[PDB]
Design a protein around this ligand. Structure first.
Ligand SMILES: Cn1ncc(C(=O)N2CCC2)c1C(=O)Nc1ccn(CC(F)F)n1
Ligand SMILES: [Mg+2]
Ligand SMILES: [Zn+2]
Length: 313
């Protein structure tokens, strides 16, 4: 009951900021996550014995891939923690509980390859789940880990509170499929502009939670420039591995994924900030004004990529 996680002073302060990097010490990430749960949710949300066992099984079920790894899980949960803390009163207790767990589990058992690569490979997961393939797999893995003896962190919820939280997690994890992001954001854009947006409308909330998940998933573009730039190498290491595997199936990959076209990366970032990241944080800032620092950081990094192209680094 009376056992707080505490962090050293620098982490204790910086963790509250959107741009916090969780650092290179793996062994501190579980504690960082427990800390965020205790402050976002309370010291009672979860049995510490069970939360700890759940965290360590989730960690075990992330693989040693360059980008889609346990550090990404904890990073994406931290961005959600900063959103929730800067919008205290807008979110239910169930939503605070469910959304940090959703972020921690959102990429469970990722191999580092896109839904498209699975489909071209004819991976069994592509037959089991025709759309949002890896994302249906991540939610599946989440439910399995929740079902291990000792791992059900939700078991103190009422039956219907339980059904609601699993349904928050499922929708949240599916929304990390970027193929669905474009439509979701357009629809949120129209609702915000015509003024029909209503957060007491579950389907409207669902959409806003989906945009939050896209925002947290892409949060590498909202870091200090050196974090952003070094993460992009991890991101590209997976993309180029996928390009290699495409070439193996006898398919020329799109240039983003072709390691023979490293030159073209700074420009491919511009497309990505302009087509994806800036629109996502713009709509997010319109709907939840206190998330503006993510838009400001994203804009700073677009400008740093413009500088790379202009030879100036
Ligand atoms: C930086 N960042 N963060 C996350 C992702 C991403 O797409 N993921 C993570 C898994 C799929 C990227 C990224 O660089 N994406 C890019 C780069 C060029 N393009 C094509 C079009 F958008 F320009 N997309
Ligand atoms: Mg994913
Ligand atoms: Zn992710």
């Amino acid at each position: 009951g009376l056992m707080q996680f505490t962090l050293p002073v620098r982490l204790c302060k910086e963790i509250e900021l959107f741009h916090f990097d969780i650092g290179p010490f793996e062994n501190m990430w579980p504690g960082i996550f427990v800390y965020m749960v205790h402050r976002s949710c309370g010291t009672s949300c979860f049995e510490l014995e069970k939360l700890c066992r759940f965290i360590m099984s989730v960690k075990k079920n992330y693989r040693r891939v360059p980008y889609h790894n346990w550090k990404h899980a904890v990073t994406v949960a931290h961005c959600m923690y900063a959103i929730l803390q800067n919008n205290h009163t807008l979110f239910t207790d169930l939503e605070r509980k469910g959304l940090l767990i959703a972020c921690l589990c959102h990429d469970l058992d990722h191999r580092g390859f896109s839904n498209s690569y699975l489909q071209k490979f004819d991976h069994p997961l592509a037959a089991l789940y025709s759309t949002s393939t890896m994302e249906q797999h991540h939610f599946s893995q989440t439910v399995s880990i929740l079902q291990l003896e000792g791992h059900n962190i939700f078991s103190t919820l009422s039956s219907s509170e339980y059904e609601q939280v699993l349904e928050i997690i499922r929708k949240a994890i599916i929304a990390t499929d970027l193929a669905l992001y474009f439509g979701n954001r357009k629809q949120l854009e129209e609702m915000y502009q015509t003024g029909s947006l209503n957060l007491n409308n579950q389907s409207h909330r669902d959409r806003v939670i989906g945009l939050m998940m896209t925002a947290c998933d892409l949060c590498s573009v909202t870091k200090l420039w050196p974090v952003t730039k070094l993460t992009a190498n991890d991101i590209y290491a997976e993309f180029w591995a996928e390009g290699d595997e495409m070439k193996k199936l006898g398919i020329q990959p799109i240039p983003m994924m072709d390691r023979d076209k490293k030159d073209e990366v700074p420009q491919g970032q511009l497309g990505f900030y302009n087509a994806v990241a800036i629109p996502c944080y713009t709509t997010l800032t319109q709907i939840l004004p206190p998330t503006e620092p993510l838009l400001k950081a994203c804009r700073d990094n677009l400008s740093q990529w413009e500088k790379v192209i202009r030879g100036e680094e």
